[PDB]
Amino acid sequence: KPVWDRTHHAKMATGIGDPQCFKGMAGKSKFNVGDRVRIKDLPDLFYTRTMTYTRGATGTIVRLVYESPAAEDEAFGNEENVEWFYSIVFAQKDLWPEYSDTFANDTLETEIPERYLEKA
Amino acid sequence: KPVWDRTHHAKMATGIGDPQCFKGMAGKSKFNVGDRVRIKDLPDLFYTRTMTYTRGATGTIVRLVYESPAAEDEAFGNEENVEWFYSIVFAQKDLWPEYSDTFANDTLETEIPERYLEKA
Amino acid sequence: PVWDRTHHAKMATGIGDPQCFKGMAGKSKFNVGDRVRIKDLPDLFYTRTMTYTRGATGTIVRLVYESPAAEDEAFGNEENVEWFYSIVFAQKDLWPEYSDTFANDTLETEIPERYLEKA
Amino acid sequence: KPVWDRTHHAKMATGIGDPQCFKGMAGKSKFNVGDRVRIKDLPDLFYTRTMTYTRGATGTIVRLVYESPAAEDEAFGNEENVEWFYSIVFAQKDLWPEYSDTFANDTLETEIPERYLEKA
Amino acid sequence: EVSDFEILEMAVRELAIEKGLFSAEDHRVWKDYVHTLGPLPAARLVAKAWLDPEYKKLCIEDGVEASKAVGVNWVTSPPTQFGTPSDYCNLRVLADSPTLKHVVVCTLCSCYPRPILGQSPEWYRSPNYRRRLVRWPRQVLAEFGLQLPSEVQIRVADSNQKTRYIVMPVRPEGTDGWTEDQLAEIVTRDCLIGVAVPKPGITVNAKRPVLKANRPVH
Amino acid sequence: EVSDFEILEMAVRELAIEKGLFSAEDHRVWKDYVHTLGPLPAARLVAKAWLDPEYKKLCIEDGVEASKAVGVNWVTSPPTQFGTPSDYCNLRVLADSPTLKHVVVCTLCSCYPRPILGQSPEWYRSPNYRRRLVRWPRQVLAEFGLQLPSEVQIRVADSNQKTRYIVMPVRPEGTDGWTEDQLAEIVTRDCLIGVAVPKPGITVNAKRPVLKANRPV
Amino acid sequence: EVSDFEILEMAVRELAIEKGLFSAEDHRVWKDYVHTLGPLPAARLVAKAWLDPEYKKLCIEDGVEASKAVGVNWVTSPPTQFGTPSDYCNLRVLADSPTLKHVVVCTLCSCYPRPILGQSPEWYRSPNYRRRLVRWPRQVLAEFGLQLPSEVQIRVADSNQKTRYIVMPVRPEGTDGWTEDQLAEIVTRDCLIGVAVPKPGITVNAKRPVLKANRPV
Amino acid sequence: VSDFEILEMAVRELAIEKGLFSAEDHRVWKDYVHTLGPLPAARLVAKAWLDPEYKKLCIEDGVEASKAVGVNWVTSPPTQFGTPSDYCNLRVLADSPTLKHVVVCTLCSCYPRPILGQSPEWYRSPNYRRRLVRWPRQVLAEFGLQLPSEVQIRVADSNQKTRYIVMPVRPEGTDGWTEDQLAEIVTRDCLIGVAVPKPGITVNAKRPVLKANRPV
Amino acid sequence: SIREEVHRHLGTVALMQPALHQQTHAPAPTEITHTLFRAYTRVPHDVGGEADVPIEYHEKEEEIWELNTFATCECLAWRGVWTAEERRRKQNCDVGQTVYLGMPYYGRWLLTAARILVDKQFVTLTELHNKIVEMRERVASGQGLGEYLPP
Amino acid sequence: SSSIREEVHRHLGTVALMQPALHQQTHAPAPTEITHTLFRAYTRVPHDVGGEADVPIEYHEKEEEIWELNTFATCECLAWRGVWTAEERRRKQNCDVGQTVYLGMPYYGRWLLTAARILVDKQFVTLTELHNKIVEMRERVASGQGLGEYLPPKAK
Amino acid sequence: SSIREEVHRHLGTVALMQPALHQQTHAPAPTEITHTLFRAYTRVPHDVGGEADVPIEYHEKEEEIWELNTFATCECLAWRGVWTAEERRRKQNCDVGQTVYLGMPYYGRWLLTAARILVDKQFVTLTELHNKIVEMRERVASGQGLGEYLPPK
Amino acid sequence: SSIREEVHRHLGTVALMQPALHQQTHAPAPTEITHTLFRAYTRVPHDVGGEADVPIEYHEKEEEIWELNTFATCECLAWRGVWTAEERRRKQNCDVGQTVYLGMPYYGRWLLTAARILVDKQFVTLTELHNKIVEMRERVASGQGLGEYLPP
Ligand SMILES: OC[C@H]1O[C@@H](O)[C@H](O)[C@@H](O)[C@@H]1O
Ligand SMILES: OC[C@H]1O[C@](O)(CO)[C@@H](O)[C@@H]1O
Ligand SMILES: OC[C@H]1O[C@](O)(CO)[C@@H](O)[C@@H]1O
Ligand SMILES: OC[C@H]1O[C@](O)(CO)[C@@H](O)[C@@H]1O
Ligand SMILES: [Co+3]
């Protein structure tokens, strides 16, 4: 019985692009460039794109990259909600206990949707 | 989004039962009690209820048990096609090379839908 | 550092092993019919008294012969000789899961005197 | 029963040292400092102190370190034969296929008794 | 002090009810139904068959119809009124004889005749039992303490599709003149699965280790 | 010797076309599009940035807009007209400097800027690279033959959401007066991933073992 | 191609002979002796016991003395004149009865009554048989095609010290008036180990897979 | 008590009962080990930095050079024939602007105990023994040490009777320093080669310390 | 007791059984034979005939959550969210080889009940994740958790 | 010698197979045997491997198989035409396949299996149609008829 | 049957994929060794009675010429006093250690141990054994033949 | 951080679940042993240089009293002529075999081997060693202490 809509995505993104097609749908961003945020350890049952190695770590937001449904929703065909995505920079020493002080300036940058962030 | 019909099964089976509700939907059976049949080694990708240990073995049909969609279809929500299910008896020596001649009369009985059967 | 390669042959030729050790253990500590428990002696490096028998109780059914214990023989030490006993164990006393249906099943094996204590 | 001589080593080495106590017992060395040598892949059953990673590789002799029974003999109580030991330098690229050309000058130095050496 | 399983069970049940998939009453009704299940009706079916040739024939030919005589209607007894979703409505009774002895398993999972027999034993559900019984039945049965003559046909029934089975063992010696109740008393769950045969004086399954739960019903 | 994968590939493709999910033309069009992909446009973007500070600023702030200058429009170049389904439309260019050097990975899979760079290397997709780079980057880079001063910030970029990255390496010495073509020539795929840096005279990725396919093109 | 085992066998034998540990003649003599071994003497002992109650008593009480009647003197038949180094000189014969059935194993290795029975079967030496028989004998025997009444005592004998055993099965029905030769013929190697019982008409061990050697005789 | 403590007691009592060695011998050896440490080796390096002639001696004849810091490889140990396990052939490996050494015993844990003390737990690990000879720059980086790519990193595998200590190059910022001041920054790790001396750093880099069930 | 130590030993040495242990890290297609292809793509619930050892079978006391999970799965079927066959395919096959034998029987039943809610979009994964956070917080704040824990 | 070095490297790789371990087979353990740590590990999303310890490997390039290029095109075309979004693909392909297949099978093997999977899960084809198509495809190959660009027909 | 053969190969192959919690051991500290593990590691390898194992279709195996020669060599060494059979068992079935005990063939252990007693009792130096192996391999490679295993070419 | 601690425990735990083709070996026939396997099985266990391994955060370890005593015993046995260090290495790092070589602790091997040389060179019988172990355990059980490990 189920009927799958095979034209929805194309109709919405053609001539615009993804994630451009979701622009403006997230409303006002909760955080700004420069803010220090800690990654919440939200349940990861079945799916997540927020790597386990980042959970509980604190980093700095360096860019509000775009707006898009969270992968946790998009991957199951749920695109009703759109949120801000942030590029965050972590100090390597804050991720890996054994990281050498000799390489004190090394970092890791990755993207995380707003739902995983909390003011540090 | 797709809509799932949550009333179909109950409307069809209430006061009748499963697999009773599929009675007569398979048409004439291809085989009959007493027939010797070999189990076809059909692809088992994603799902099958015809055990690997039976593939390529020959047994005797001892009963036409009922009519029903094959599990291979029912398990994916496809019930449009209904076929005959047969209870088949295999000699243990035809399944396991090491089976002892001392236990010459031992058997294994199990059910297999028509799609897996071919005249021996 | 020289090895005596004639000792065993000189002692056992025309006699046999373990026949060549007959009488060397003196008086046996146990007798046919005695109930004995197997002591869990240290087994570092070598033993011929299976782990599955440790702590189990059985019945001596025969004093089979006298011989150095394997624990000594396997390291070139044959100065001491002791009595060897054939012991019968009830399977249920060895394996917790053994079925009551097969209540008469047993296991017989040999154990030197050092591992035995009267039950 | 065999008797072990527990005074031999001390009588031979006291006040002299090991391997100093074997000095002069190897006779004339087969190789000289500067010679290129390949490591023979001699059988290694039961014992060897010539690492598998060096077998078949070519290196340069940088020092005749001392004379001593080979470990293959000493480890089994056989000290009747004494041979020359050589310190050999291998280019890392000649040991490990993946070694980077960026670290073109890296090396590995280790000691090998004469029996394992053949003119490259 | 509550496990990840308990946390998830609560989450799934509350979500299901919030979304109107099933109600709290539905859930309570199902739990109660399962709580009433047991091997008694199956044992009674076997005893009746031993005492009545015509009923025995019915058991062998149409288990679904025979089950009605002991109060278990495979279609109407379950809350659905279309049989339980997982056990279906095609019970078959396998009759042992002096030359035939049956034992049941679901190699693909744990398929069991719940409506007339109750929940499956933990071991019946084990990968071990599911791997071994179909191939080494006499060895597995011997472990259970059951042995049959070598000439007797041991038949293993693998419940892989919609049929569920109960074994009707042969009536044992030493029960002459026994009443239906006396006979049903010795037909245990294990006898109905096929890993044991009925014996006068034995009215409960053979004792075996019982693994305790972290939080069982109080 | 036809493999189980080849049998299944054919089965899936025939079924999809038979059911009208996509057309035979769609499939040919996608394969042909992929055939046109490669590292040249990305290398050209880097050369152009080195040769024009104002373009470099654009690359750093808006990779999508900058990409248009090398003929790769992330929205309209792909057959979809909405960007490729898997690479999306948010390219970011990471600019190395005397105090910063970037290297990219997709720990969750193999996310790569295909429209401007081509297909990902086999090793880039390996569980090994995906496990190790984010944690032991200096060790992994050394294995690749790249070492940076200890005080330089090595930044590993994990391409986990819809952004894809290319690395703009620092222009090497020995290239005074070079043309755009000369500069683009030394910016290899490996330089754009970040496991190597451009060097005068080196115009191909460092040689590595190549595992042969049972049935290549 | 010669294997690493064949190379080492030659190396060991040549070194042993060169060092005077044993002679080339010794090795030939031992191989010749082994070649004469087999299950026939043990089968004759069983047949003789079935036909002579007094001899049967002797077999049960003193296997070594009984063995002499079938031409196998445990002390003097082997080249050593002190019994084989590995089988020793204490054979015990286990008598089955209507209430007792024996089966043998060497859980520690492969101990077997070679002088009177020949070489051990490959499966007898297996870790599998050595692990399982002592604990699940009814199941292992069933796999071999042998089942006994539940009330009968199945006794597993573990040959862990210097005693070696042979099983004297009960004489089967259907052999009325049979000669010693006829009776001995149905007592196979497997019957003497205990994994099978003698049956009229069966004169060879039950057929089972035979793993071929790379270079047999 | 553990199975190891039970066995240690058994072995020691049996050895003494059989006259293999005496209770006094055992105490003599433990006392000797207690006198060992990394200081003599550090002093050898400091002396070499301050005396070119001595440095040459260190490089050519480590055994003779060791005498200057009171460690005679033959006569200092109780045996008077060198320790049974460390022998009498110390070689000093001299780092330079173009060469940097690091040591390992891939076959076990061979270490210059007489002049350096007991080996670190990690030095004995299968891990260090497997990796250092093949990926030295990666392992050294983990330890926080990196050298120019053109510098020759040489891994010395102590597989026979030679034991090594590394003589690092003298670091900047030590002009006019005394022998004591210089020796103080030559830590055990510097003598193994996993670290280089630095003014102000007088102890090995802090690392996790696994506690013993029953230490002294 | 000595026998207890003996049986613990017999079980422990199995951990040390020697093997040629070949870790697999996304091998190339050329390393996959038809035999391996069939083995990797088979449905995990099909174990009949596989060799296994004798184990002393045990009964197991039922966990309250197992009883609730079973009722939930049958109620979801009773009310048309799925048929039992759809459940079996998802529960005994789709979970994959590792979870199939590494997790408990009812653990798979439960994970799959959660799974059908998300796959058929009756709840979003976000709603499920949020609900899990809610249950944990209810427990942490002393509010209890159904019949598993009183306030 | 090249032959000796080859044997040396084969040896270094082979001994890894013999690395000792305490190997605990898991056969549907009871809930009481599952700790929170184990629960999180078993319910992990397979694709999340960043930070896991691994050894150094000599990275290689690999030639593309014709079937891999076709699989990639099929997956993108299915998305282009609305059968799924790339995120739905990733979730099914890199996670739903489970730990064993995730690391035991090839990268593109998972892409292909998942393309077949979406056709069945969204009911665009029945599993029966997929099974039947595979049977028919095998027959094509076995008959000498050829298989597209993978195998030409046997001729005269 | 080709299909049955594939079915049986499958049943054997899936065993390789049996899930497990595989803990590699790399020289753990004493604090990681329990009494249970100490007893298991210091066990005598040949003591396997009672250990769980699966049913296998037992097979017979043809004897290799080298196995017959090895057996004769071992008994001859005992006959002539180099060792007693008990010394052989201890070295052969226990001293070889867990891995070799189950990873190598039955007679492979008998042979390795025969070589071992020659070296341990100093009847030959390890060097003589190593040299003999080198010579034997050269003999084979040259076409000179190898006893009854390979005739001269 | 409790979360970071859980993260790191997780990264370590999933390693246990790494998929593999696990082939148990139960005394394979000679025809199943290739030259490659023969060389690998007959290898000297201590020769590990060059083998692939992962990065581990190296730790120092506090010395056990029994380890210090074991070391002294081994050097004293050599000092007094029971063995040379090379005989010890061969017995301790090679003869112990692959499993014990990596399954037991470094000093556990030193100790086992010290016990071993006493028996192999017949300075004590295995019976004397077994009896002594029983004696040590009884000394502990009876409250009489055990050297510096346990006071009376
Ligand atoms: O006929 C169906 C009825 O049967 C009775 O035995 C049950 O108690 C009812 O719940 C059910 O509805
Ligand atoms: O005998 C040669 C030896 O003498 C020196 O050149 C000087 O003492 C040493 O380094 C070397 O070992
Ligand atoms: O060829 C395989 C690669 O892995 C090893 O066998 C073991 O680390 C290497 O020596 C080789 O280069
Ligand atoms: O070899 C593995 C074992 O499993 C099978 O392949 C299939 O049941 C058997 O024939 C064999 O004995
Ligand atoms: Co089931």
Ligand SMILES: [Co+3]
């Ligand atoms: Co990716």
Ligand SMILES: [Co+3]
């Ligand atoms: Co034996």
Ligand SMILES: [Co+3]
């Ligand atoms: Co060392």
